[PDB]
A paper describes a structure:
Glu-342 is located at the top of strand 5 of central β-sheet A (s5A) in the P17 position (active site residue termed P1) at the base of the reactive center loop and forms a highly conserved salt bridge to Lys-290 and a hydrogen bond to Thr-203.
To further understand the conformation of Z α1-AT, we carried out crystallization screens on various α1-AT mutants expressed in E. coli and on glycosylated Z α1-AT expressed in Drosophila cells. Only crystals from glycosylated recombinant Z α1-AT yielded a good diffraction data set at 3.3 Å, and the structure was solved by molecular replacement. Unexpectedly, the overall structure of Z α1-AT largely resembles that of wild type with a closed 5-stranded β-sheet A and a fully exposed reactive center loop. Although the overall resolution of the structure is modest, the electron density map around Lys-342 is unambiguous as shown in Fig. 5b. It appears that the positively charged side chain has a minimal effect on overall packing around the hinge region of Z α1-AT. Nevertheless, superposition of wild type α1-AT with that of Z α1-AT reveals subtle differences between Z and wild type α1-AT, with a change in orientation of the reactive loop and a slight shift of s5A at the top half of β-sheet A. The reactive loop of Z α1-AT is fully extended, and in the wild type α1-AT structure and most other inhibitory serpins the reactive center loop characteristically takes a U turn around P17 and P16 with residues P15 and P14 poised to enter the central β-sheet. Close inspection of crystal packing reveals that the P13 and P12 residues of the reactive loop from one Z α1-AT molecule are packed against either hH or hE from a symmetry-related molecule. It is likely that both the crystal packing and the increased flexibility around s5A allow Z α1-AT to crystallize in a native-like conformation with a relatively extended reactive loop.
Author numbering: 24 to 346, 353 to 394
The structure:
């Protein structure tokens, strides 16, 4: 898979964009799903609008042809959405065009075939009816998990994109529920948050990085996925966020050997909701949202723009896992994730970052 380093660098630029905006808010998104969403949308666009999207998704058009990109994305969607997939995630993309627009079939069918997404037709004249139709589709798609995603629609909304993703993975090495107890999470020097802290003594692929000045924990999910947590040292979060590059992450993933440790990891449920129009606008994706948008591939009768693009990622880190291990005699280091930390979810075989985020406060819904 040759598109991974682009998704990786797209993830970091998208992350640092959000980290630059807010200092003390939870960051959590899926750069794979977001990229997929707009890689799929790239079929409907043409000319400069088409070029602006991919280049904004961190793809040099000359270095990697679009024909090769789209199948590269399809290979991920194939890997994620499998039969008997123990990843246990429900990602899905929903297009919502206004009834009356004569839609191009070429686009619609490639949305279903190449990207396994699904487009719908809705009456945007009725705002509340549309809002419900969007959120019910998401509620349907996420098995009732994500609800009331779209809080508002514009009066002249013509084409709305919505990209949800839920993930409740199980660890290869579970934490004990009895061990989990209430502990303080130091969000900053003043704010302190009581959180259910999971904790297990055992062998973890955990190493204190000197390059990042951070404790770097790696935990294998059940099924082909891995969770990399980065716990920065005292006042090194800024340093950490800057120093992270795909070359560095891969350098940790390929490290296998473990170390005995007394880990404190917070049980949490974080949701990141993002107006992609606003967020990707900062990264460079702007013309598709503008009036002069080349969406002739979607519909060629009337002019069109992507009037709304929303994304909501939901994570559930909890103690549950699968159904031996020997610990050395030495005193294990007590690595506590009680202060804000960055983390990624990487798909094992493609090495693509499903999720990325920073926990500022676990109780922040
Ligand atoms: C990853 O999944 C493949 C099948 O999709 C399996 O053969 C392999 O053992 C898995 N590897 C790990 C490390 O989970």
């Amino acid at each position: 898979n040759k598109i991974t380093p682009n998704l990786a660098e797209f993830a970091f630029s998208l992350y640092r964009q959000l980290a630059h905006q807010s200092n003390s808010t939870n960051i959590f998104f899926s750069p794979v799903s977001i990229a997929t969403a707009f890689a799929m949308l790239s079929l409907g666009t043409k000319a400069d609008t088409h070029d602006e999207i991919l280049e904004g998704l961190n793809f040099n058009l000359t270095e990697i042809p679009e024909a090769q990109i789209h199948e590269g994305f399809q290979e991920l969607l194939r890997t994620l959405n499998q039969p008997d997939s123990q990843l246990q995630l429900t990602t899905g993309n929903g297009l919502f065009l206004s009834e009356g627009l004569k839609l191009v079939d070429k686009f619609l069918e490639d949305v279903k075939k190449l990207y396994h997404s699904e487009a719908f037709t809705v009456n945007f004249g009725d705002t509340e009816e549309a809002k419900k139709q969007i959120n019910d589709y998401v509620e349907k798609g996420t098995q009732g998990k994500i609800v009331d995603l779209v809080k508002e629609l514009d009066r002249d909304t013509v084409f709305a994109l919505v990209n949800y993703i839920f993930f409740k993975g199980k660890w290869e090495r579970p934490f004990e529920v009895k061990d989990t107890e209430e502990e303080d999470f130091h969000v900053d020097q003043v704010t302190t948050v009581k959180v259910p802290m999971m904790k297990r003594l055992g062998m973890f692929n955990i190493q204190h990085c000197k390059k990042l000045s951070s404790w770097v924990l790696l935990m294998k999910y059940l099924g082909n996925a891995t969770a990399i947590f980065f716990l920065p040292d005292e006042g090194k979060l800024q340093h950490l966020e800057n120093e992270l590059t795909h070359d560095i992450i891969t350098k940790f993933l390929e490290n296998e050997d473990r170390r005995s440790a007394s880990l404190h990891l917070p049980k949490l449920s974080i949701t990141g909701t993002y107006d992609l129009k606003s967020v990707l606008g900062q990264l460079g994706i702007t013309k598709v949202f503008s009036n002069g948008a080349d969406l002739s591939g979607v519909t060629e009768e009337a002019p069109l723009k992507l009037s709304k693009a929303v994304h909501k990622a939901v994570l559930t880190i909890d103690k549950k896992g699968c159904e031996l291990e020997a610990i050395p005699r030495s005193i294990p280091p007590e690595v506590k994730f009680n202060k804000p930390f960055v983390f990624l979810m990487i798909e094992q075989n493609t090495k693509s970052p499903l999720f990325m985020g920073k926990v500022v406060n676990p109780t922040q819904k």
